[PDB]
């Protein structure tokens, strides 16, 4: 679940600073690292209905952030979705 | 015959009967006597007295085997649970130890349905 070394490394790439955790790019890039990591978990344990509600919350919390970012800064939004790969 | 020295008394108490079997230490039975077959047919074999009578009767039938010492192993609930122990002393046996063996599942097999 995004071990410290793997979660303090995403903050460095996407954060404007090295100590900036919480920027919309960082938050969405952190969430995307978990939605793309649980795909292999749920492709084996299909009946894990209780852990899927956690995944369906990380998915929606990301879309809520993207809509805020897109309205606030279109240029920054269209650059994040291609640096990451989504909106399909 | 075989004049065994140390035997084990197996009491099978229940809510409807009381079966007493006296065996040697290797688990080979020698004699037995129940409550219902001892002239206590009906609502009387449950009583803690019919267990006493059968315990004396089962204390017999090993007279030929010359038993002097005993270990009492009480199984099941019921009225014939204690009255049938002292009846073995009344026959002269020397009780070595009293072990309660009772099948208690650790939430295993499902019991029957409730009566109404």
């Amino acid at each position: 679940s995004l071990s410290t070394e793997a979660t303090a490394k995403i903050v460095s790439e996407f954060g404007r600073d090295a100590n900036d955790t919480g920027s919309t790019e960082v938050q969405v890039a952190l969430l995307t690292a978990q939605i793309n990591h649980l795909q292999g978990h749920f492709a084996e344990h299909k009946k894990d209905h209780h852990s899927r509600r956690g995944l369906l919350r990380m998915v929606s919390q990301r879309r809520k952030l993207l809509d805020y970012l897109k309205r606030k800064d279109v240029a920054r939004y269209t650059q994040l979705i291609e640096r990451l790969g989504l909106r399909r | 015959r075989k004049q065994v020295s140390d035997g084990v008394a197996h009491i099978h108490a229940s809510f409807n009967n009381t079966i007493v079997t006296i065996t040697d230490r290797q688990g080979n039975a020698l004699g037995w006597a129940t409550a219902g077959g001892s002239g206590f047919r009906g609502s009387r074999k449950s009583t803690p007295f019919a267990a006493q009578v059968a315990a004396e009767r089962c204390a017999d039938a090993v007279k030929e085997y010359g038993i002097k010492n005993l270990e009492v192993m009480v199984k099941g609930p019921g009225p014939g649970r204690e009255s049938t122990i002292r009846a073995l002393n009344a026959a002269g046996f020397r009780i070595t130890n009293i072990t309660d063996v009772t099948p208690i599942p650790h939430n295993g097999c499902r019991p029957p349905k409730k009566r109404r």
Binding site: - | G76, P77, I85, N97, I98, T99, D100, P111, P112, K113
Partner: protein, 70 residues
Amino acid sequence: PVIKVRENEPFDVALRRFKRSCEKAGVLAEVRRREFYEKPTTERKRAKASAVKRHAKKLARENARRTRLY
């Protein structure tokens, strides 16, 4: 409830010792519980009522402790 008859006792003492062990091990109470199936819903209601009366009587005696009858 294994008890070993120790040295030089009267029988009634050793027998009354073994009975104390059966009462303390609760073997008789356990068997009477396991003779019939109690539905899972009837157990929860039977436990709750056996923790309410325990509480309600506990308050009742204190609530009646500060009273003079005559």
